[PDB]
Design a protein around this ligand. Structure first.
Ligand SMILES: Nc1ncnc2c1ncn2[C@@H]1O[C@H](COP(=O)(O)OP(=O)(O)OP(=O)(O)O)[C@@H](O)[C@H]1O
Ligand SMILES: Nc1ncnc2c1ncn2[C@@H]1O[C@H](COP(=O)(O)OP(=O)(O)OP(=O)(O)O)[C@@H](O)[C@H]1O
Ligand SMILES: Nc1ncnc2c1ncn2[C@@H]1O[C@H](COP(=O)(O)OP(=O)(O)O)[C@@H](O)[C@H]1O
Ligand SMILES: [Ca+2]
Ligand SMILES: [Ca+2]
Ligand SMILES: [Ca+2]
Ligand SMILES: [Ca+2]
Lengths: 75, 375, 372, 372
């Protein structure tokens, strides 16, 4: 809510909930999934962590995708 | 995290004023920006007959008042009435003294400079706030969505503008503005309601036509097939109840009114629709950043609250763009108040405290400090 | 115990990694970008200078400057930014532990060598350092000790004769056209089809068109005849806006600027006969091996048919009493790094390092006597 | 016995007249207007397409489209309407009797040349035809055979070096901003004074404001300082609805987009250094007169003070060991037509015509061998 943090969670559909936000890292493609009940600050933190993990760990050799419910890509 | 603040966010849009505190999830006072003055003879002495009514009480007594909007297509016209509006929203709605609270205000792009100097002059001299900032509405709407890359189509009651921002950097040469919004849709609906014999001339009748536009109108997916369906059958007709007890019915006028947004030639303007305005807003940007801007179309404002406008927008942009591109359109359900929500974010950020225009900067630099600090 | 670093500073493509590896760990273009619009999304990690492939990603909203032009270091602060991005962001290592091996252009001025020594030893505080030459390290990458090297990267083209594992400074020659000038030529000859590319942001798009779709014609005039008559060689490319362009005779006209410099107006010689001009400047008795080892290096040797056309053009104008072969390994675009990796990992390279304490009581002049 | 015709098809202003004259007979803007409302009063001369200055007269009730954009013909049927309106209504001549001379932009695609040949021979049935270049007729109007020509009209700006009476195609460059983009930038920078112009009907009013009240500042920052401090340069204009606008510092900020394209977000070079970029691309021997003959042409060279600012900007970044002079004749907005009228009226031009029977047994390909 105020102190927003990231935690590594194992890769499964059961780990997803609607109240938080999620960052799926698949190498050259990074997907940002936002919940419907997710708020403003963790959306901003998800965007900031996404641009950080693109431009620092991969040095811009990635493409960040933003999606929500119903608009999930094929990846 | 982000540090606390005692700032106020006051979206002073063309139809509504949305005022509240920074850090909160919703604006505390939402009320339409009108000033009502009586046009009838007051024969009953006493009982507090005011010379002017402001806010929601002006909506309550609108039959015996003439109503004026001091904001006309984003430009503030009558400064005394709009000063009365800020006095009402500081003292009567929020019930706070502005002397110990910074204030954040909103403005459309490509407004005249004299709006910014006069807004600076009445905020610093009259109310004596300790700080001020003014920001673009579409930047604040993109703050609300949480994204950084995207084109925002912000359409209030007076101004409909396209702003593309790639990463953190806006492109000022690609800013489009069109004076086609809910005022002109309300006036066009008032024109086409005479085809069924219903006459609406006064300002309270303009408020009633605004209510029927909010409550019944919708965007058709394809205009000619929906016109043939409405001509063939009578299933599309719907009813509405006047406050005096009369009942009216409307058919094709449900979808002919928002079609002015996609075809402005109904009201005599040769400028093209909002879809082509979005398309050449994308085309005026340079070639490397079209891919991300197609997939992050964001709408905001009450004028984007029609049902079915996202599907028509998707079909028109999918027709205009080349077929290999994926086009995604973001329409959150809280997009009416997204300007204020992003304002609460931007007032609540820790970085922002070294961009407040303080009192001493205004005293040393005149009202022209705001163009060197803001935008 | 510690591992050395190899860093090949190319004119438009810099390679880096650890010693003892069969491929460079990071390949990224040496581009320093600066923003050209104002950042209204404040507090969200906006930077005054984007460097490396990060600048390549958001290349539309930046102006891009090359710190090395024509193989020679010119802008030094941006070059230090390339080094800071290379050590700290790319390789993710501290420079204080690892010795660093660099590569220099042939016939570099000595002041550039002294300043490379000074910003390596002072700014990053390396424990050991060494400088070496592109072309002889490409020859060690070819497994040979005697031969000509045509090193044609992004800035210049160098022709280096080497005998007994050492270059011959009278006979290295320079020809100033490479893939940057080919990109500008392709930028010129797409205007007749109606496609416009005028700024530095879409120059890498034209470079990608050059990399994906180009080939060297073995004979040029009949290829004009077949391209004018038929349309079998016309192929399409997908721009990242989604517009599809189509390329006909301009696919192979762009390699031919190397053989005909008068396509872009300068009076100098083509790439085939300048090797003849270099090899006539050498001594007679060496030439029997010196023609036989035709080492090709650089990323502008990736074109298909460059070897057969090179063999034909050398065989036309050399005397007919001698056999000519052209060699072109598949890893010759990384061969300078492969040479740096094998030289940094040797059992005899520990005494050839320039240590910190040797730099302290000699200053920036010990690099001349040891890198020699 | 018959008289030839000169027809310079500008991107926003088309000129036409008879050969051998000191001025073009008809100058009118190249627009095609179409009605946007329903004509309820029938039988009173309503047309489905107004063309020429007639569309400029009743421009309030029309939508306007430019058939030529960026110097290149795009919409062809509207261009046929333009040619019909030149031949029949303006000049009041039958096209079957008079030969016609045409002008094109440099680096014109070949298909446009063939299509101009095809519609000029088939539709109107001319007896003779010839196609020339803008810049060579601009140089012939100046009485020179070697020089740089800056043709900056309404669509595009061209820098063309010409040596020995012929252009150098490797050094011609096209910078794509002109008076249309200046009109759009002035349309942008009149909003802050509260004046709103949006549609194409009032774009011509902004063009008239740009023509009547603009000037190039010799130095920009002190001009901005004196505009901010005093009010001696603020002047008024009378709009045709009776309202009076006033303009201050925007009088000189809008010519400065030619020197600074970053005002409209274009990353490309300013107008002074692209001529330098053209002149280094020429050969080293022929620069000495080429710097001396600085020929300015086009309607957007008619600002007061553009020549002195141009002299200052060239003299700043050129080497100081040579003299820069710029010529600017007062008739330079019609100089293409003057060069065409001199060229058509000669005693050696009757053999250079492309006659009808030469078009018959060659098709639309004889223009590739005769207008060169
Ligand atoms: N497949 C390809 N086809 C065409 N050109 C290519 C290809 N691959 C790379 N290039 C070009 O090769 C150049 C990069 O090669 P290389 O890495 O050897 O150069 P460099 O080390 O930066 O240059 P220099 O030796 O001048 O310092 C660029 O101009 C690039 O466009
Ligand atoms: N006095 C003036 N000051 C500034 N601009 C002017 C003036 N007179 C004309 N122009 C502008 O010059 C342009 C037209 O000039 P000109 O006739 O040379 O161009 P053109 O032949 O139509 O263009 P192009 O060569 O690109 O085809 C228009 O933009 C017009 O507004
Ligand atoms: N549900 C709705 N359907 C259609 N239009 C709406 C709806 N709600 C609000 N509007 C329109 O939005 C306009 C005001 O929107 P908003 O942007 O919130 O206020 P402002 O324009 O003052 O900033 C009104 O003119 C109204 O016509
Ligand atoms: Ca949560
Ligand atoms: Ca609004
Ligand atoms: Ca190299
Ligand atoms: Ca012209």
């Amino acid at each position: 809510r105020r102190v927003v943090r990231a935690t590594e969670v194992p890769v499964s559909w059961e780990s997803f909930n609607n109240g938080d936000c999620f960052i799926l890292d698949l190498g050259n493609n990074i997907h940002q999934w936002c919940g419907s009940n997710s708020n403003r600050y963790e959306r901003l933190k998800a965007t900031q962590v996404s641009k950080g993990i693109r431009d620092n760990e991969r040095s811009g050799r990635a493409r960040v995708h933003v999606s929500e419910e119903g608009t999930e890509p094929e990846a | 995290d982000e540090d606390e603040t005692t700032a106020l966010v006051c979206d002073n849009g063309s139809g509504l004023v949305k005022a509240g505190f920074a850090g909160d999830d919703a604006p505390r006072a939402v009320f339409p920006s009108i000033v009502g003055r009586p046009r009838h003879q007051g024969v009953m002495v006493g009982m507090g007959q005011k010379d002017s009514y402001v806010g929601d009480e002006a909506q309550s007594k609108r039959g015996i008042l003439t109503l004026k909007y001091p904001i006309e297509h984003g430009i503030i016209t009558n400064w005394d009435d709009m000063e009365k509006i800020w006095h009402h929203t500081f003292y009567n709605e929020l019930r706070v003294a502005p002397e110990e609270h910074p204030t954040l205000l909103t403005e459309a792009p490509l407004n005249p400079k004299a709006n910014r100097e006069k807004m600076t002059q009445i905020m610093f001299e009259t109310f004596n706030v300790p700080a001020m900032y003014v920001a673009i509405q579409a930047v604040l709407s993109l703050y609300a969505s949480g994204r950084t890359t995207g084109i925002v189509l912000d359409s209030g009651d007076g101004v409909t503008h396209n702003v593309p921002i790639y990463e953190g950097y806006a492109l000022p040469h690609a800013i489009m503005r069109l004076d086609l919004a809910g005022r002109d849709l309300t006036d066009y609906l008032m024109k086409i309601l005479t085809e069924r014999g219903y006459s609406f001339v006064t300002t309270a009748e303009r408020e009633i036509v605004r209510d029927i536009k909010e409550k019944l109108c919708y965007v058709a997916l394809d205009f000619e097939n929906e016109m043939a369906t409405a001509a063939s059958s009578s299933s599309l007709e719907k009813s509405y109840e006047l406050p005096d007890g009369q009942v009216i019915t409307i058919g094709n006028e449900r979808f002919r009114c928002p079609e002015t947004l996609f075809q402005p030639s109904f009201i005599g303007m040769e400028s093209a629709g909002i879809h082509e305005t979005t398309y050449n807003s994308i085309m005026k940007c340079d070639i490397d950043i079209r891919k991300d801007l197609y997939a992050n179309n964001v709408m905001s404002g009450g004028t984007t609250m029609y049902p079915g406008i996202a599907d028509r927008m998707q079909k028109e942009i999918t027709a205009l763009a080349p077929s290999t591109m994926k086009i995604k359109i973001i329409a959150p359900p809280e997009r009416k108040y997204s300007v204020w929500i992003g304002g609460s974010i931007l007032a609540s950020l820790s970085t922002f405290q070294q961009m407040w225009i303080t009192k001493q900067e205004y005293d040393e630099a005149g009202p022209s400090i705001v163009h060197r600090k803001c935008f």
